[PDB]
Amino acid sequence: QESVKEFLAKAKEEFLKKWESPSQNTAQLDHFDRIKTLGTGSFGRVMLVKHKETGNHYAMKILDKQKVVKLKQIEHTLNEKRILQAVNFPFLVKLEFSFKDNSNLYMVMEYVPGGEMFSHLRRIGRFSEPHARFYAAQIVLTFEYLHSLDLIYRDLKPENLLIDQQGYIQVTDFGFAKRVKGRTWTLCGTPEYLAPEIILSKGYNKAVDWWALGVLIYEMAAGYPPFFADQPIQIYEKIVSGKVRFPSHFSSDLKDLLRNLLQVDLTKRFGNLKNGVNDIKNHKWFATTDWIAIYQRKVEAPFIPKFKGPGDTSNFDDYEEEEIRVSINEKCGKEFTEF
């Protein structure tokens, strides 16, 4: 059968064609009815919308161009759109349209209706190890895919992981994703998830994604992250210390995996050794994982989100709504020419 190497080479050829010739301007605002805000962020909001012609529901991410410029996130936002329109993997959210107007940037994605992993995790407290493992396996495959394309993701957390109608993961928010063949230096990410080499202002590489997977698995299985404190500086001190405490309920296999992902020396960290991702896939904690079956989405999920029809948003918190205003003057046109 096809080898993993051949699979990934075909994925790269597919990605590169879209990476070098990105799609642009494939819809406009009055193609959609805006329904409800699904989530918010630094530069705008994500809204449930209905496409008028098809009746399909989508999730429309709206970014205020002037705010992006002010917070010095122009290149990151160009990264986000250029990468998201070029990737294709079962656990990555599908971009359907993108466009811009005088005031805003718009990325219209497939609507993932089961809510954030964050919401479910906080509510239930913690996931069982089989439950955490099912989600972790999807992240492992997704990072295998992204890294083979020279992409670093850099914003793994339950707030950016959505549950679909099958109970599988959809990764969203490519705001810090970047295509890089060497090391990179940007201080970005979420405090609890930062690898030590980010904090220490070293160059860093895709090994920070495997560190963040360690944080995610720990948080999923424990119900709290391995390093937390009210002040981020105190979080950073714990991260660089090289000390992790584990709940007594963690299996010995889980602790061993986590010691190797939450390894402060990036040169000894799993995912960053000679065998790459296979040191993670072959680890005892994943011994029951059928990696091909996960990729094919044939495994029964630990739970299916409740759904009461199309356009149901009950798996999402409510947010204060704010009407879109589009200025009569084009803002920051040159900065976002390639969007």
Partner: peptide
Amino acid sequence: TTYADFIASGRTGRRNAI
């Protein structure tokens, strides 16, 4: 317990980036 210390902390809601 560590769980109680987390739930009493200021970091249990949605977390912003740096």
